[PDB]
XYZ file of C-alpha atoms in Angstrom:
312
model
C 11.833 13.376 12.558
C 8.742 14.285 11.058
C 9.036 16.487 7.287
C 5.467 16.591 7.652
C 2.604 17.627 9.855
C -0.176 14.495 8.973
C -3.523 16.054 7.397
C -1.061 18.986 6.354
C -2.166 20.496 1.807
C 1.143 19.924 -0.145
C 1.229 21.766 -4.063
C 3.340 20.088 -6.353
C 5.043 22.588 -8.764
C 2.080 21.799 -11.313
C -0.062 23.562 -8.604
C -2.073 20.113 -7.776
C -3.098 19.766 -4.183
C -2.551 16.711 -2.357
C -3.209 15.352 1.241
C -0.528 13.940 3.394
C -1.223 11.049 5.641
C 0.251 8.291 8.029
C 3.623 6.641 7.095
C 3.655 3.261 5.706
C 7.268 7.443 2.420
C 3.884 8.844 3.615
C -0.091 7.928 2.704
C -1.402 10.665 0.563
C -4.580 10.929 -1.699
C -6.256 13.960 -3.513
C -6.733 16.831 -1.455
C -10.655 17.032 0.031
C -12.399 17.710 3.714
C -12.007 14.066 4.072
C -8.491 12.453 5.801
C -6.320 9.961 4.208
C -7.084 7.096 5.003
C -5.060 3.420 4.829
C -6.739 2.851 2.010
C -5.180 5.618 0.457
C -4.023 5.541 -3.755
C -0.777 7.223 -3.730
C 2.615 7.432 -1.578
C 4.780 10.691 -1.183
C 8.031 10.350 -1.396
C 10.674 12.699 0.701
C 13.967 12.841 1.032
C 16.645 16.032 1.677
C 16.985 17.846 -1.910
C 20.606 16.810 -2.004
C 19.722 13.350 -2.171
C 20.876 11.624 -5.542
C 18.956 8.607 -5.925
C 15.156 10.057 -5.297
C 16.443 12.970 -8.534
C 17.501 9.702 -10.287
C 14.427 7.970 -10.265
C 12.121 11.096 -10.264
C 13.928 11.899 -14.003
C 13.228 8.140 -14.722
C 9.432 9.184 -13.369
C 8.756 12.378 -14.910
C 10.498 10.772 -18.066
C 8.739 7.407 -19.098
C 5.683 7.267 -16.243
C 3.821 9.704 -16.494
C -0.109 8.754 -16.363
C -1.175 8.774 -20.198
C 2.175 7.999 -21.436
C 1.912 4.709 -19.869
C -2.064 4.448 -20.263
C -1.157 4.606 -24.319
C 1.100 2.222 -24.326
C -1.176 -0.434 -22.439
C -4.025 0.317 -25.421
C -1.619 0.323 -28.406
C 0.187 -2.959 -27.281
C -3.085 -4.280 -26.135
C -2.285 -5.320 -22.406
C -4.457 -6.096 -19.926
C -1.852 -3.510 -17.459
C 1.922 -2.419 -17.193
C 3.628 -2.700 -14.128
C 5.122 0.354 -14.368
C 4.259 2.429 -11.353
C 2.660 6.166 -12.410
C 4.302 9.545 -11.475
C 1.435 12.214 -9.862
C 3.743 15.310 -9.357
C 6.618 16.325 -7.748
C 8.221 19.356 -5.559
C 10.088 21.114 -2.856
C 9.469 21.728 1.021
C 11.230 23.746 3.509
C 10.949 22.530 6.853
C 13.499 23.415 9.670
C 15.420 25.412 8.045
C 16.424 22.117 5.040
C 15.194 21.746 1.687
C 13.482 18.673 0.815
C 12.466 17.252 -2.479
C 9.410 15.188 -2.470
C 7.175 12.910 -5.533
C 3.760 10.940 -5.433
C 3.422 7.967 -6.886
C 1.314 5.119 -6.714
C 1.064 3.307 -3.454
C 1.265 -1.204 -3.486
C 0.271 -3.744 -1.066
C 2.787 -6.398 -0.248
C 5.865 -7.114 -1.671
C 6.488 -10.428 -3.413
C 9.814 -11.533 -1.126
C 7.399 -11.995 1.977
C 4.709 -13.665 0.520
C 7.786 -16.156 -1.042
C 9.274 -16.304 2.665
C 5.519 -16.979 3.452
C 5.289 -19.875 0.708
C 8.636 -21.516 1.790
C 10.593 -19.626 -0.414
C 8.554 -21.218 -3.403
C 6.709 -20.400 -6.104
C 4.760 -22.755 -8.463
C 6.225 -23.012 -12.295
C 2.444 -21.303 -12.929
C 3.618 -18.111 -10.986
C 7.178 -17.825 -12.584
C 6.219 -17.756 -15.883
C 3.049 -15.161 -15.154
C 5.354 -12.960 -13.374
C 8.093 -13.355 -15.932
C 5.653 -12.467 -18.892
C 4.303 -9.265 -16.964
C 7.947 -8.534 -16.028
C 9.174 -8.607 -19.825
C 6.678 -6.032 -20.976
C 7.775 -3.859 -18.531
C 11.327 -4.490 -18.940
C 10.367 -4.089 -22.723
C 8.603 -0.336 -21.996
C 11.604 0.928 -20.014
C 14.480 -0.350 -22.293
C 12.065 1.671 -25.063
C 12.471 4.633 -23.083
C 16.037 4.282 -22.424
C 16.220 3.078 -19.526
C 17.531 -0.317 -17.419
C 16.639 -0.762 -13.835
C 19.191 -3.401 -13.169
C 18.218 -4.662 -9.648
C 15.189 -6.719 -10.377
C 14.007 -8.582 -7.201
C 11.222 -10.273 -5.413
C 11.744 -6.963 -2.751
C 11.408 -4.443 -5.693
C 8.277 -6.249 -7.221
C 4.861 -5.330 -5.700
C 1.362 -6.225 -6.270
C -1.454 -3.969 -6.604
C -3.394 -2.994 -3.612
C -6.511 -3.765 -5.325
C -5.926 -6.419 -7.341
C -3.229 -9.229 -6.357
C -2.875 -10.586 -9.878
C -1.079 -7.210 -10.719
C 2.669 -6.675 -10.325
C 4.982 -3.425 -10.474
C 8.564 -3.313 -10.777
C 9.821 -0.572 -8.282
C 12.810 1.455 -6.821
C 14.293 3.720 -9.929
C 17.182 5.470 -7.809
C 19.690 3.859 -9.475
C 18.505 3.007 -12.434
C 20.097 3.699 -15.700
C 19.943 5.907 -18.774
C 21.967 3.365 -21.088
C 20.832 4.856 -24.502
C 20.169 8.999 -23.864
C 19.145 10.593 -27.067
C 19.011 7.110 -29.066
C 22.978 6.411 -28.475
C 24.007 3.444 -26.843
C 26.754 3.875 -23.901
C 29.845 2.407 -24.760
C 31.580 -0.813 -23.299
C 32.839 1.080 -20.249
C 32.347 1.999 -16.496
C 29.825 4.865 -15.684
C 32.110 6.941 -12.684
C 28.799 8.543 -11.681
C 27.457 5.375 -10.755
C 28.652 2.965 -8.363
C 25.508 0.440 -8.168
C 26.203 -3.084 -9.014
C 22.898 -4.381 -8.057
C 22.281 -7.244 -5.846
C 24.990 -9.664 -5.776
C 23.129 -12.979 -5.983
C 21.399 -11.594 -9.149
C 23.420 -8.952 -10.651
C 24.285 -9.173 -14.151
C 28.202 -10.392 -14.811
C 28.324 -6.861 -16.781
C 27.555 -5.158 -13.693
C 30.245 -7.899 -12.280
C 32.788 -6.845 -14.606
C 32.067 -3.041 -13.545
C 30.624 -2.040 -16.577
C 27.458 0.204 -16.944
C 24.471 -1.862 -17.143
C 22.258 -2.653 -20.832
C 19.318 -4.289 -21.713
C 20.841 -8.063 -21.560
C 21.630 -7.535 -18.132
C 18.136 -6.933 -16.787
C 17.212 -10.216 -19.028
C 20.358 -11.787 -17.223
C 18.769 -10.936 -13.681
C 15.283 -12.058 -14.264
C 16.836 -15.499 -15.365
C 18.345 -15.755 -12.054
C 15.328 -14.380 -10.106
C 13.251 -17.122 -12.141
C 15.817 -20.319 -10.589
C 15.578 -18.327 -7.234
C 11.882 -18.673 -7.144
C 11.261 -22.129 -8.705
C 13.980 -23.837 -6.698
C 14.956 -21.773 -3.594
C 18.156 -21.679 -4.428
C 21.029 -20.356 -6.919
C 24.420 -22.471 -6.847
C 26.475 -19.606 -5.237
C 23.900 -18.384 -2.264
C 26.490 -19.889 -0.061
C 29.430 -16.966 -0.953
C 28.071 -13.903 -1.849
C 30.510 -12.175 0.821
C 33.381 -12.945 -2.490
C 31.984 -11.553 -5.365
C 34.719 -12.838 -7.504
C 33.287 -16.259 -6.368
C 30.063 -15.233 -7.728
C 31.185 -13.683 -11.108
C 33.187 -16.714 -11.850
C 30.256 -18.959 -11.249
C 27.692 -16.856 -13.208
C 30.521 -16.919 -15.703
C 30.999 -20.806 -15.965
C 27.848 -21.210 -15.985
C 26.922 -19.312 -18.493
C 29.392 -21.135 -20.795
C 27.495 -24.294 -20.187
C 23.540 -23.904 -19.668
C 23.290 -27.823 -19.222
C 25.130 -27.924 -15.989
C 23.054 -24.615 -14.486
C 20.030 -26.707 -15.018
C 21.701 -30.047 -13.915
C 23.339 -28.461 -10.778
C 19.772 -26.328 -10.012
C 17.678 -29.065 -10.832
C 14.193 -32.808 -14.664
C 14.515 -29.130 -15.782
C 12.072 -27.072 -17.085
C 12.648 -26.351 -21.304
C 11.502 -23.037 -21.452
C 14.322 -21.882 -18.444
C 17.004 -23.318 -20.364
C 15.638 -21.948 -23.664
C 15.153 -18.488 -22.126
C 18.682 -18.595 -20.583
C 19.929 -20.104 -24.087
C 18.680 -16.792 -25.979
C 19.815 -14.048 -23.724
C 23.080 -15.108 -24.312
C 23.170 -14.869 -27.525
C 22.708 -10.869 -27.237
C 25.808 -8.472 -27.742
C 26.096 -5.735 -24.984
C 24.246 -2.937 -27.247
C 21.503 -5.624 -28.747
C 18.006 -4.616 -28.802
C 15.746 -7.608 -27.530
C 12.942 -9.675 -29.389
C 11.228 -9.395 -26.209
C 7.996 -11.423 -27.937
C 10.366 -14.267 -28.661
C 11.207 -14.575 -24.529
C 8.051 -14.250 -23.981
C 6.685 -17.076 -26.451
C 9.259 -19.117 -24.762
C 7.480 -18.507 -21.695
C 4.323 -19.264 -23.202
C 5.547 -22.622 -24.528
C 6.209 -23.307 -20.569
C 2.501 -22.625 -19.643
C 1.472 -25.187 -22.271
C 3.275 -27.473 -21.091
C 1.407 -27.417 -18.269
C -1.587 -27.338 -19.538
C -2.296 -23.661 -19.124
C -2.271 -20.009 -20.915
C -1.601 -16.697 -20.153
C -4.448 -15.759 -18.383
C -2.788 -13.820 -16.113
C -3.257 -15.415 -12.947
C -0.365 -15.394 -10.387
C -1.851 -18.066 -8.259
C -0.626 -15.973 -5.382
């Protein structure tokens, strides 16, 4: 079905005007006499207005990406970008007698899971540690605004269309308001949310059915970061038991020496990372700087520096 006729004017409820295009979730660009083209800047969004995971992650939107918000926080912490993707409006459209709800946002080129499928399901030590760093500050910005996205993946990280040494951290519909108002969520199940995450990665919080928190996106990341270097995590070969998996994650985590040794010469700055985010209670509050010197101390050890080249 088709929610929109291609080359049709769309107003958001700010009264902007915007161009719909081809589907790649639709191309759209500012509207002008000219089409949009492939090269287009921006996606729209649509789903029916009863849909809970596109309101979930156009709060998260409207909330903590919107343009200069984000722009600010790239001057004031001095980085080069923040892969967060930026919110351009939002509304609703009748069509056939249904309500639908739809956003812009920025559009990506490819996702990182193919191009690691195209690399053998490898990436160099080089690229780990330059995606981790870029990851942390924007793990860092959205845990500021109160929020954990708790399903980081190679399939939810995607590089700029312009500029392939540029990565955004995607997909917000079930991401998680863990401190609203400055209060931390309690120690408990959320029973308006039913999302453990990915079960290869997921946080053993999210395991033990609790809401997620800000040591369980660190949690995830640490497993992404053994996916990528070695093309494999120890329990890839039962994630249809995900008792299996918790206990694993579990043991494992009790003794950091045998990840490496079972995963694995290790790299220091892994274990180190690994070593720290355990050390964080369920309502802790990062030292995000400290993770990410302990990611820098990796690049040296290579003989390199943040320069913030992917190597893609």
């Amino acid at each position: 079905a088709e929610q929109f006729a291609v080359g049709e004017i769309i107003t958001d409820m700010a009264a902007a005007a915007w161009k719909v295009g081809l589907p790649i979730i639709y191309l759209a660009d500012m509207n002008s006499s000219e089409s949009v083209g492939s090269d287009a800047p921006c996606v729209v969004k649509v789903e029916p207005s009863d849909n809970g995971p596109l309101f979930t992650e156009l709060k998260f939107y409207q909330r903590a990406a919107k343009p200069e918000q984000i722009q600010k926080w790239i001057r004031t912490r001095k980085l080069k970008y923040l892969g967060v993707p930026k919110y351009w409006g939002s509304g609703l459209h009748d069509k056939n007698g249904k309500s639908y709800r739809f956003m812009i946002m920025d559009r990506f080129g490819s996702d990182l899971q193919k191009i690691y499928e195209a690399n053998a399901k490898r990436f160099s030590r080089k690229t780990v540690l330059q995606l981790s760093l870029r990851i942390l500050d924007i793990l860092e910005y959205i845990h500021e605004h109160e929020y954990v996205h708790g399903d980081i993946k190679a399939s939810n990280l995607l590089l700029n269309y312009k500029n392939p040494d540029q990565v955004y951290l995607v997909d917000y519909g079930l991401a998680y308001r863990y401190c609203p108002e400055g209060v931390h969520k309690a120690y408990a199940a959320d029973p308006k949310r039913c999302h453990d995450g990915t079960i290869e990665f997921t946080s053993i919080d999210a395991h033990n059915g609790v809401a997620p928190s800000r040591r369980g996106d660190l949690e995830i990341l640490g497993y992404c970061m053994i996916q990528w270097l070695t093309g494999h995590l120890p329990w890839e070969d039962n994630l249809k038991d995900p008792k299996y998996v918790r206990d694993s994650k579990i043991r494992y985590r009790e003794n950091i020496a045998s990840l490496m040794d079972k995963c694995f010469n290790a790299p220091g700055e892994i274990a180190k990372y690994m070593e720290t985010v355990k050390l964080l209670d369920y309502t802790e509050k990062p030292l995000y700087e400290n993770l990410r010197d302990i990611l820098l101390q990796g690049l040296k050890a290579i003989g390199s520096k943040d320069d913030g080249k992917l190597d893609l």
